[PDB]
Each structure stands twice: as structure tokens, then as C-alpha cells.
Design a protein around this ligand. Sequence first.
Ligand code: FDA
Ligand code: NA
Length: 516
Amino acid sequence: APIETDVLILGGGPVGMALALDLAHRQVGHLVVEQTDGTITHPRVGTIGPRSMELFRRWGVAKQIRTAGWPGDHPLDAAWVTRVGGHEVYRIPLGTADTRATPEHTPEPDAICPQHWLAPLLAEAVGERLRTRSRLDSFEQRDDHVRATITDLRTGATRAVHARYLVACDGASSPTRKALGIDAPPRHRTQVFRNILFRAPELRSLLGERAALFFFLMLSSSLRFPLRALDGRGLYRLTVGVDDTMDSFELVRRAVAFDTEIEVLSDSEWHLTHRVADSFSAGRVFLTGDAAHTLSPSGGFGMNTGIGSAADLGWKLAATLRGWAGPGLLATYEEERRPVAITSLEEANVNLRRTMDRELPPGLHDDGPRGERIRAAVAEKLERSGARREFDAPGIHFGHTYRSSIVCGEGGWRPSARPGARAPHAWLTPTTSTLDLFGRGFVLLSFGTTDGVEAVTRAFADRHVPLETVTCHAPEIHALYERAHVLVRPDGHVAWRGDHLPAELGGLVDKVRGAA
Ligand SMILES: Cc1cc2c(cc1C)N(C[C@H](O)[C@H](O)[C@H](O)COP(=O)(O)OP(=O)(O)OC[C@H]1O[C@@H](n3cnc4c(N)ncnc43)[C@H](O)[C@@H]1O)c1[nH]c(=O)[nH]c(=O)c1N2
Ligand code: NA
């Protein structure tokens, strides 16, 4: 018989899963179908965003990700070398998990957690709602729901799923997207690389102090990319460029000066694409993650961008499914994220270019200081190239200010409380971040007077819009937020702020919930 759920999530990837996690906290009926059995062959994601960690903090799986296995003492450095274990050109020291100065504008510093340890962790949090070895064969929208056919690759049986909404997180090649006939045109030249995943039990030990998280190699046209430590325990990945031939083990050898054990596990080829979808949805069917926006892996914004996009669609679907959301709300999913996707895409392309552009002087490898200062050349050249930005982008992670139909709009990135932005972090208790008050429904922070808040309470009450009022008394945070009254949304972003509440409250409410 037909399995009927509120939200059918097509795809078990990080984004599709993040969505499930959010929906879970919002008590939304959902089910996730993943064709593969659920395990990672070639781990792609390695770095989890500070903002993605704040969300996981809410969804209660952050502690886990942090302690999933990345060596607390493993360096987080990014070094530029002629050959891993050869002539070092430049290095950005970034301490270690257990050693770096705690963040400040956030309670969750970025974490390292290779996808194969991540996938499991999430699978657990999602629990029973995840259907592995289940493939979506087709779907068809009805007047008020979507019907899909899923094959149980495992028992051979094919059942139907009747969901009220279909969120497609099927990845970059997103068949769903093609089906709906939505195009995701290239915004930058599509490139090709080969990712070689290999084990090397003695490499970190041979490296010693020289150990590092990323090794950007400066050896050739195809071998001028990073070789990164996936689990800081022997697993590495040397990404190499292509031009229409070499041997896997050969390439790794080319890259590693040491003559140590080297076991090649994979040599999967991939395409670097910079493409966002013309539209983010079509009726009761939506796109999320790479399916909606896939950009360059440089600086690792991909999943994180989708996780945010995940969180956005998250509450909005819940609002609609509950009935308090205005009919225009779901539409604002594209209105707000598509732009983010694009600014994130570009910032990535920037990182990419910083490498594609950087040239390699012919006398870079040559030993002996008679052609060694040739390195001190490109050395500062990089310093100047502003390359550390590829590892420090609070702007891309915490920045993004929505400027849309449901927002009462007003150098380096800094925390703001201005409408459309992510309410900034600040400790209410050495154990409680302002960030922790948000996530469920709407929230109204009042730093001074509690005058007129009752009116606001009633206002929301009428339209059945969930609202919570917290009366804060910290002058320090009052300053951070600036205005006396700040209305944060379920997604954690400010929708309105002012020293005086509006007169036509009803109007307000109907605006922020996509009713106006
Ligand atoms: C080399 C490299 C390195 C990185 C990255 C990319 C690359 C190429 N990224 C980008 C990141 O991997 C990407 O943004 C996410 O994987 C996207 O996740 P999704 O869940 O959206 O889809 P994803 O592409 O992961 O998964 C799609 C899922 O849908 C399933 N599926 C598809 N069609 C189906 C069907 N018809 N029926 C059933 N199941 C179906 C698939 O089997 C799969 O599980 C990254 N990002 C980041 O944040 N940090 C990082 O460190 C990196 N590093
Ligand atoms: Na880092």
C-alpha cells in the first residue's frame, strides 16, 4: 500500500540529510530515500563550516562530528611545496583543533570530518526515516501532492510514496532538475580533475613538524593542486589536473619525495562545475544542494551552502505544512538562497583562480641557494596574493544578508543584527549562546523595555504564528544588536529591528510570514 508522508526527500547526501535533520526538529513528517547502500567509496566533503556546525549544534550532532576521529593534535596548516616532502615555499600556520584560539563571533569553530565518518553520523541522527538501497524511478505532481515510485533495490519490491512536497537533493547531475526542464548554465569554464585517494601509514611520521592539512603542490600544470589529509591518520587525496594519461601510483610518487608505503585506493575522475539553477522549484517539487547550486570545491563552500539552503527550505516547508505561512513564503526559498548560491559560487571561483593563475618559475625545484631565493620570490608573492582567505571566510559563512519580500530591509565581515542577516553570537550564560534561542519558531529579543511586547504576542497569536519573547539584560549584547527590539526568524536571521515596535503589527506579521 501507498506510503504517504509530508515531505519526501529524494537523496541521502549531506544536504538531503541536513534537511531531514531540520524537518525532524520541526516535527515535520518526512522520509529519505537513498539508492546506494549508504556508504562512501571516495570521501568528498572534508571540512564542515562554522555555520554548518552551529546548525548541527542545534540538531545535536556537533559534539559527535568533532570527535568523529580527526586528530586533535594534527596540524591544520596549509603549505605550498614543490613536492610534498621537498622544497617548502610558503606556509599558513593554523594550529590544531585542540590548540587554536577559540572563535568569538560564533560558538562553533569549523570542524574537520571526512565524509565517510560524517555519513554514518548523520545516518544515525536521521534514524529510521532513512531508506537506503531505495531508488526513485519517477514522480508526477498532482493538484495537491506528488507521487513517486521507489524501487527497493534490496528486496526487489516497488512501492509508491505520496508526499505533499518533493525535495530533490539528487546531486549535481540532478535528474529531477532535467526532468522538470530547469537548466543550470555554467558561470565559469568547466574543468576536469582526477582525485587519487591513497593510504600512506608513514607519511605523517616522515613529515613530522612539516605535517599539514593541505599541500598545494607547485610541480606542474596538472600537479599544481592540493594533496590533503582526509583523516590525519594515513588517508590522503592528491587532486591532479588534466589536459587531453599518467599512472595513479606514478602521480602520487611524483608528488611525494619520500619513499614510503603507498596504497592507491581510488582514481575517480570529476568535473569542476560552476552552475546554479534558473529556478529552485517547480510546483510541489524543489531542488536543494548541488541539485540547486553546485560550485567550486575551493575553500569548501559546496555542502555548507547547501546545508544553509537546506535549513532555509526546512522551516518554510514546516510553516506551510502547518498553515501559518503565507502562500508566498515557499517561493522566497529561491528569492533568498539563489542569490547566496551565486555569491558563494563566485567567492569559490576566486579561490580557484588564485591557483589556476599563480605561475611556476622554471627554477623553483633546483637545489642550492643559487636558485633557491627564486622561491622567496613566489613566496611573498603568495603572501600578497591574499591566499589565506581560502581558509578564513567568515564572510561567506556568516555574512549573507537576505534582502527580500519578507525582510524589513534597512571591507571585512563583522557581526550585524540588521534585517536579513544572521543574528550575531554572544554568550547569555557561559553555557548559552544567543544562537541557542533560535531555531524553533520566531523569537523577539527585547534588550530594554518590555513595553508593547504583549501586543506583539497577541499579533502573532492571531495568525497562529509561533513566537517566543526573551527579555535580555546584557548591555554588551544590547550594543551588538543595536536596536531595542529584534525579531529573529525560525531560520535564525533577523526580520525586523527597531527601538520602537511598529503600530500596524498585523501588517508586520503578515509580511515576515510571506502573507503580504
Ligand atoms: C573533491 C571535492 C571535495 C569537496 C567537495 C566536492 C568535491 C568534488 N565539496 C562539495 C560537496 O561534496 C557537495 O556540495 C555535496 O556533496 C552536495 O551534497 P548533496 O547532499 O546535495 O548531494 P550529493 O551529490 O552528495 O548526493 C546525491 C545523493 O542522491 C542520491 N540519488 C541520486 N539520484 C537518486 C535516485 N534517482 N534515487 C535514489 N537516490 C538518488 C545519490 O545516490 C546520492 O547519495 C565539499 N563541500 C563542503 O562543504 N566541504 C568540503 O570539504 C568539500 N570537499
Ligand atoms: Na581550517
